[PDB]
Write an enzyme that holds these catalytic residues in place. Sequence first.
Site, PDB file in Angstrom:
ATOM      1  N   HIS A   1       0.854  -1.219   0.000  1.00  0.00           N
ATOM      2  CA  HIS A   1       0.000   0.000   0.000  1.00  0.00           C
ATOM      3  C   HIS A   1       0.892   1.274   0.000  1.00  0.00           C
ATOM      4  CE1 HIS A   1      -3.209  -2.840   0.889  1.00  0.00           C
ATOM      5  NE2 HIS A   1      -2.601  -3.184   2.020  1.00  0.00           N
TER       6      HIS A   1
ATOM      7  N   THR B   1      -6.494   6.433   8.092  1.00  0.00           N
ATOM      8  CA  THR B   1      -6.916   6.688   6.721  1.00  0.00           C
ATOM      9  C   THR B   1      -6.778   5.447   5.828  1.00  0.00           C
ATOM     10  OG1 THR B   1      -4.711   7.523   5.998  1.00  0.00           O
ATOM     11  CG2 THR B   1      -6.386   9.128   6.845  1.00  0.00           C
TER      12      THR B   1
HETATM   13 ZN   LIG Z   1      -0.831   7.446   6.631  1.00  0.00          ZN
END
Ligand SMILES: [Zn+2]
Length: 257
Positions: free
Chosen positions: A61, A195
Site C-alpha cells: 500500500h 486513513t
Molecule cells: Zn498514513
Amino acid sequence: HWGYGKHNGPEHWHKDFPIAKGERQSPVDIDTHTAKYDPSLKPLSVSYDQATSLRILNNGHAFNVEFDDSQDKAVLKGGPLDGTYRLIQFDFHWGSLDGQGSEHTVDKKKYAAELHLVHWNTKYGDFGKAVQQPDGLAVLGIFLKVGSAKPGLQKVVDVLDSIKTKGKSADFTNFDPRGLLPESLDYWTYPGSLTTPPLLECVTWIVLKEPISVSSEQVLKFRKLNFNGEGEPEELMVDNWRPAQPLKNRQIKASFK
Ligand SMILES: [Zn+2]
C-alpha cells in the site's frame, strides 16, 4: 484485498470496513476560514531526540518506517492532547503527479504528498489496545510540496530501491525523524480516524500548516515503488491517498491566530 485501484480502492472500502461511512472519518478538507483559533491550546511538544527506528517495509500500500517503542523515547504531547503519546511509525501518501497526493486538503488544495507520524497513548500500554480507544492515537500530519530537496529525507529515498515490491522489508536504524519537520509547529486539529483500513476512529489529528519541500527527484523515487509483489504484473505505487471525507459534526481548531 483492499487497495487504491478502481475495483478495490477507497470507494469500495465500506464493504469490508463499514466504519468507512462513520461519523469521524479521515482525512477531511481543512477550511481555513471556518477553523477557529483556540487559545486554550497548550503548546505542542515533539520530543524525538531518542527516536530509534527498526526497519522499513513495503506493505503493498505504501512503506512504513517502524520504531522501537518499548521505552519512553519519541513522545508527542501538549496541544490538544491529554497525556503522552509514543511514536511507533511513519508513512507517506503520494501522487502519480505533483498536483495530487495528499489526504488532507487545505481549502481544497492538494499537496504532492503527506507524511504521518503515528503515536499511541501510553495510558493504553501498547498500540493494539490504544486503537480500541477513542483517544488512542495521535497522528502528526505534514504536507510535502515539490521544490527544494529535504536533506533529512534522502536516507529514506535511497533505501527504497531495496524494498521495491509488496512484502519486502529492510533493516532501517538510526533514522532521525526530526529531519522531516518544518520550522513552525502551527497546526490544525480535529478528531478522526486512521486513513487506511481498518479505518478505526481513534485518532486525534494534528496537521501542520507549514509544508516541507522535497525535490522532484525525491518524490519521483517514491513513484518507482510497486503495489504488486515480485513476479506479478508491475503496478507502480502511486496515488495511495484516500480523498477527503465528510466533516459531519466536527470542528477543526487552529493553534495560531
Ligand atoms: Zn498514513
